Every structure is written in C-alpha cells, then in structure tokens.
Coordinates of N, CA and C in Angstrom, one line a residue:
X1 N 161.2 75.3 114.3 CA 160.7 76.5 115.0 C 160.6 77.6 113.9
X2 N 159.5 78.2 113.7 CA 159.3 79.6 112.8 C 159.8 80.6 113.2
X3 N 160.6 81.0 112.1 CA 161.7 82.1 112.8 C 161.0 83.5 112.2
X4 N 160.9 84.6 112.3 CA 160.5 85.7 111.6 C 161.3 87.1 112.2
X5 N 161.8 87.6 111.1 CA 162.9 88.5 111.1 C 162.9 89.8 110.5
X6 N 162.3 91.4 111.3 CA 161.9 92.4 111.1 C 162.5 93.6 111.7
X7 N 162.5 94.4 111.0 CA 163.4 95.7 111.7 C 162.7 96.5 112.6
X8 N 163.4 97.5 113.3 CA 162.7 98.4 114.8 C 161.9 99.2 113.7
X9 N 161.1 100.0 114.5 CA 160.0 100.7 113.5 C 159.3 100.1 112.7
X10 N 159.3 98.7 112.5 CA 158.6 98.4 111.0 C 157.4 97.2 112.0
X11 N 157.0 96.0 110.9 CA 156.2 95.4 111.3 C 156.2 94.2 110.9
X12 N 155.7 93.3 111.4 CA 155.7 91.7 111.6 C 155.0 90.8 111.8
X13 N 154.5 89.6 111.0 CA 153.4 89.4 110.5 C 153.7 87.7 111.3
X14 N 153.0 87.8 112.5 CA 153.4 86.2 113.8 C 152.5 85.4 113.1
X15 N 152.8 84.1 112.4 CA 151.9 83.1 111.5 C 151.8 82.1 112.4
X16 N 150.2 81.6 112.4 CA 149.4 80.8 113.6 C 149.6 79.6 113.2
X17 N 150.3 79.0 112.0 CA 150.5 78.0 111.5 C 149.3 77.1 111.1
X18 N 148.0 77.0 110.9 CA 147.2 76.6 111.6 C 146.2 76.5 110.2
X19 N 146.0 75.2 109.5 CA 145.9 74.6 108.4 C 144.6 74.4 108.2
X20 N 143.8 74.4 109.5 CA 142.6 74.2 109.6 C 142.0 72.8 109.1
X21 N 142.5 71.9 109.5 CA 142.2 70.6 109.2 C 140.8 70.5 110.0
X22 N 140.7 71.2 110.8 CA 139.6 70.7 111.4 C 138.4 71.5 111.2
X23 N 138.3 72.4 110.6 CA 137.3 73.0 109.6 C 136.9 73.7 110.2
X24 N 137.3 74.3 111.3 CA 136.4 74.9 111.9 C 136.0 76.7 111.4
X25 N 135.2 77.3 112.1 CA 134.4 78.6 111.7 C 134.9 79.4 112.7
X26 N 135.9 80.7 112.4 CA 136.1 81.6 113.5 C 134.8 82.1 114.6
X27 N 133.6 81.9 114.7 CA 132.8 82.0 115.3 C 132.5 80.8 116.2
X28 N 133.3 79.8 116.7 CA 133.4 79.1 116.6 C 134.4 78.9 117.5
X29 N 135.4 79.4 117.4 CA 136.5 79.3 118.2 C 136.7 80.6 118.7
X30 N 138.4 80.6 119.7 CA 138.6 81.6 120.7 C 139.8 81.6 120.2
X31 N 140.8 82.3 119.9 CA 142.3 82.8 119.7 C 142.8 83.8 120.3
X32 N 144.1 83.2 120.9 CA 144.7 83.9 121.8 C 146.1 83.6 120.9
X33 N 147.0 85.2 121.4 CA 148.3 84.9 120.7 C 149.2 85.4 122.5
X34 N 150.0 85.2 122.9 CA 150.6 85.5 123.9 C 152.1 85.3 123.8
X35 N 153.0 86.2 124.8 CA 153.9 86.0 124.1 C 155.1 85.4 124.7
X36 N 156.0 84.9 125.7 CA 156.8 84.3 126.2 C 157.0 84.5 127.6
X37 N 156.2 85.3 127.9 CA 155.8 86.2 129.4 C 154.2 85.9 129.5
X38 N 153.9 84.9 128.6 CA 152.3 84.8 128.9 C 151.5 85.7 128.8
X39 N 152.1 86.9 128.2 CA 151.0 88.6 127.7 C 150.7 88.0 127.2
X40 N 148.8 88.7 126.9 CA 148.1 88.8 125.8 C 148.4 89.6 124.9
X41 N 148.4 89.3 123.6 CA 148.7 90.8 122.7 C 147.4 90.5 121.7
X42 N 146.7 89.5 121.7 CA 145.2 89.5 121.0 C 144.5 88.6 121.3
X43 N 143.3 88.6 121.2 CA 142.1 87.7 121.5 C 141.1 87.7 120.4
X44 N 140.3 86.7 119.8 CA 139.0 86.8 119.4 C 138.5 85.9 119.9
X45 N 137.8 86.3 120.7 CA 136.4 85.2 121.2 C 135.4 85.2 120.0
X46 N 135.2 83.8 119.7 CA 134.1 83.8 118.8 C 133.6 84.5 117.7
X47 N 134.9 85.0 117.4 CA 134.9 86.0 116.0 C 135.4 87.1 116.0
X48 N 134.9 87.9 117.7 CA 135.2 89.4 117.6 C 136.3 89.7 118.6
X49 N 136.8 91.0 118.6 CA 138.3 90.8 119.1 C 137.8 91.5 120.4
X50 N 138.7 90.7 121.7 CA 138.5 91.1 122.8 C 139.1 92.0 123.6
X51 N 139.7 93.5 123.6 CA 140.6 94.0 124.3 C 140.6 94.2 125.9
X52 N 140.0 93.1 126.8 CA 140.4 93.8 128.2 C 140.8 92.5 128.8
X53 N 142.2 91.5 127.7 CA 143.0 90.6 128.2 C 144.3 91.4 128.0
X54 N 144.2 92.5 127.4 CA 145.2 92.6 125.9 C 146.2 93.4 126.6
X55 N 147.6 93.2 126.7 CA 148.4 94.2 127.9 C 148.8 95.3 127.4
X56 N 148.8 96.4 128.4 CA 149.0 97.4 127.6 C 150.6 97.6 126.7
X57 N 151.2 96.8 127.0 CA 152.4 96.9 126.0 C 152.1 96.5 124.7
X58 N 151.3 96.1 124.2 CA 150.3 95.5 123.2 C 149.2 96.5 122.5
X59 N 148.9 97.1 123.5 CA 147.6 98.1 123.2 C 147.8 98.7 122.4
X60 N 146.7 98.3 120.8 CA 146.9 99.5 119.7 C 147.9 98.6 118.5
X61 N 148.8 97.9 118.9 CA 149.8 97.0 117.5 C 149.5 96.1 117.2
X62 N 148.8 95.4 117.6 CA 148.0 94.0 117.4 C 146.6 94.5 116.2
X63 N 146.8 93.1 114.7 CA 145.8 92.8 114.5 C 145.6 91.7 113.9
X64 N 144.4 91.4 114.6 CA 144.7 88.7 113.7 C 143.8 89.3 112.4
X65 N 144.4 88.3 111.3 CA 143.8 88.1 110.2 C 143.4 87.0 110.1
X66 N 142.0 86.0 109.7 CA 141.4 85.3 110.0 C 141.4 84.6 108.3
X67 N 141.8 85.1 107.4 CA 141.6 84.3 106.0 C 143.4 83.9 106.0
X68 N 144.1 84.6 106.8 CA 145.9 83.9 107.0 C 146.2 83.5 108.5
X69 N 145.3 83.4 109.5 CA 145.4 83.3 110.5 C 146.6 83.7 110.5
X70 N 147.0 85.2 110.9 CA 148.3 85.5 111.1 C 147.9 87.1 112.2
X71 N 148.5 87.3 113.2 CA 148.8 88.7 113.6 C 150.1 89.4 113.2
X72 N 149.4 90.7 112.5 CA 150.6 91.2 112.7 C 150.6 92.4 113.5
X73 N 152.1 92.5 114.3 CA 152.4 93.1 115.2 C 153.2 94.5 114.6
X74 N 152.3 95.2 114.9 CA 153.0 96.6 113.9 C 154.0 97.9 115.2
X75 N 154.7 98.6 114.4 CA 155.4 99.7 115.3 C 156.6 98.7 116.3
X76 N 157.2 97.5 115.6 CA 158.3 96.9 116.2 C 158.9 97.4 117.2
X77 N 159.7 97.3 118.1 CA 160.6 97.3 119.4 C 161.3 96.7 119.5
X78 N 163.3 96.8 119.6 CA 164.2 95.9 119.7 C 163.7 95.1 120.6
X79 N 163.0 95.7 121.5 CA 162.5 94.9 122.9 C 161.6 93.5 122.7
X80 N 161.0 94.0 121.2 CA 159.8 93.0 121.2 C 160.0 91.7 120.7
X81 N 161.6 91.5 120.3 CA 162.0 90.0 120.1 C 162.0 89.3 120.7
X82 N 161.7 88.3 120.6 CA 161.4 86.8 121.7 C 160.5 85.6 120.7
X83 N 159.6 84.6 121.4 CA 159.1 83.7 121.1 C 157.3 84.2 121.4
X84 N 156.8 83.9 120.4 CA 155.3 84.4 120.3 C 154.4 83.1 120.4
X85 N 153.2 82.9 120.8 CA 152.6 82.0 120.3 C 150.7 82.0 120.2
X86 N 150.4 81.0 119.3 CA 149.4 81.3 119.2 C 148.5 80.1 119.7
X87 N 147.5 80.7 120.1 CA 146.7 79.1 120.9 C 145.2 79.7 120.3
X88 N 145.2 78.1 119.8 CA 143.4 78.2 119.4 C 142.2 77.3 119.9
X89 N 141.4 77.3 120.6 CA 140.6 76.8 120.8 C 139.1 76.5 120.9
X90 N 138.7 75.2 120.8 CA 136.9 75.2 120.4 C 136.6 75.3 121.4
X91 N 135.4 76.4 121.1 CA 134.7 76.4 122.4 C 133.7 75.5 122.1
X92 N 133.1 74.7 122.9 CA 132.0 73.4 123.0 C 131.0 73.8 124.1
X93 N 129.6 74.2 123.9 CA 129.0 74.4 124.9 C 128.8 74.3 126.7
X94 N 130.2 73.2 126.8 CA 130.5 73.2 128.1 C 131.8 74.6 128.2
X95 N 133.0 73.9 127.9 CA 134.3 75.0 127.9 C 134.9 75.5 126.6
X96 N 135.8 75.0 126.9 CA 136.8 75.0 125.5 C 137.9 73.9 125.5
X97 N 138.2 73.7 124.1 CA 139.0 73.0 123.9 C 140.4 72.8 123.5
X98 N 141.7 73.0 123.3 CA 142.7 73.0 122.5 C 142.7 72.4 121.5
X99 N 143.0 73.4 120.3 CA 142.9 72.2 118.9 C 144.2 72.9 118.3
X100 N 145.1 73.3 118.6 CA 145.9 74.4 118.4 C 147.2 75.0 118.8
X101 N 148.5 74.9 118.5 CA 149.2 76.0 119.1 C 150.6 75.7 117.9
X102 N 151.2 77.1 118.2 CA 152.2 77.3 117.2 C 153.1 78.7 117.8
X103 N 154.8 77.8 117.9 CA 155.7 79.3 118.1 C 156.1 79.7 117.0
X104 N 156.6 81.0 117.4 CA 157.1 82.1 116.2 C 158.3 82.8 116.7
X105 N 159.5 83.0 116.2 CA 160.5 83.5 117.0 C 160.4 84.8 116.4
X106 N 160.7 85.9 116.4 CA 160.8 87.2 116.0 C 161.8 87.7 116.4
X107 N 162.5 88.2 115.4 CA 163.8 88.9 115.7 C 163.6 90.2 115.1
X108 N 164.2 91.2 116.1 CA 164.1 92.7 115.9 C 165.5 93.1 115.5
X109 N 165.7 93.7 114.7 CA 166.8 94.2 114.4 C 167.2 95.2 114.1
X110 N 167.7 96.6 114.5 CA 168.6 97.6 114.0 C 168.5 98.3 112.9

C-alpha cells in the first residue's frame, strides 16, 4: 500500500501508480481519483478536466498531472487523511473500460 505523508497547510502529490503499459493516450481515456467515501476530487474525461462530479470539499485543491500521472491535492486538512484512489479507464466507442486502479494512504499531520 502507498503510503504518502504531508503536513496541515501544505500539499500532497496522490501517485496513480500507473506505468502505462498499455500505451494508451490521455485523450483516450477517463480518470477519476475518489477518495474512501467515493468523492470525486478530479476527473479528466478524454483529456479535459471535468468539474460537475467534483465535490465541493474538493473544489479548487485538485490538480492531475498527466506526464506523472499524479494529483496533487493542495491546502491539506488533518481531516483529509484517509485512503485515495485512482481509477482509469478506456473509453471504447461503446462504454468504458477499467485498465486501472491504485491506493494511496495520506497522512496529515500537525
């Protein structure tokens, strides 16, 4: 389990683990990161980022990086420690597909 360990006020960089063996092209896929409560805290559909999954406890701290596949979640919260995860999926002209997922534990600290 990826553990990631960051102070209140500061910021934290949730890694999607995600090697890309399968080559795919962020245009291409959908990424969702959610977090142990099944919030959204980011989305990119097909490249571009979608805010009307995104909860407002989220709203504004969230940003994915697509050359580290990583979000980081800025303006920390003792509160915001828990288990994060990231799900990635192909979309295929019918739906989508799972090719993807990875936890992150985040610890807030004092």
């Amino acid at each position: 389990m990826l553990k990631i360990q960051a102070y209140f006020n500061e910021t934290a960089d949730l890694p999607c683990q995600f090697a890309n063996s399968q080559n795919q092209s962020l245009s291409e896929l959908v990424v969702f990161w959610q977090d142990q409560e099944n919030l959204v805290l980011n989305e990119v559909y097909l490249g571009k980022e979608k805010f009307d999954s995104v909860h407002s406890k989220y709203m504004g701290r969230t940003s994915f990086d697509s050359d580290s596949w990583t979000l980081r979640l800025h303006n920390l919260q003792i509160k915001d420690k828990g288990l994060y995860q990231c799900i990635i999926h192909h979309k295929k002209p019918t739906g989508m597909i799972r090719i993807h997922q990875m936890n992150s534990e985040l610890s807030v600290l004092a």
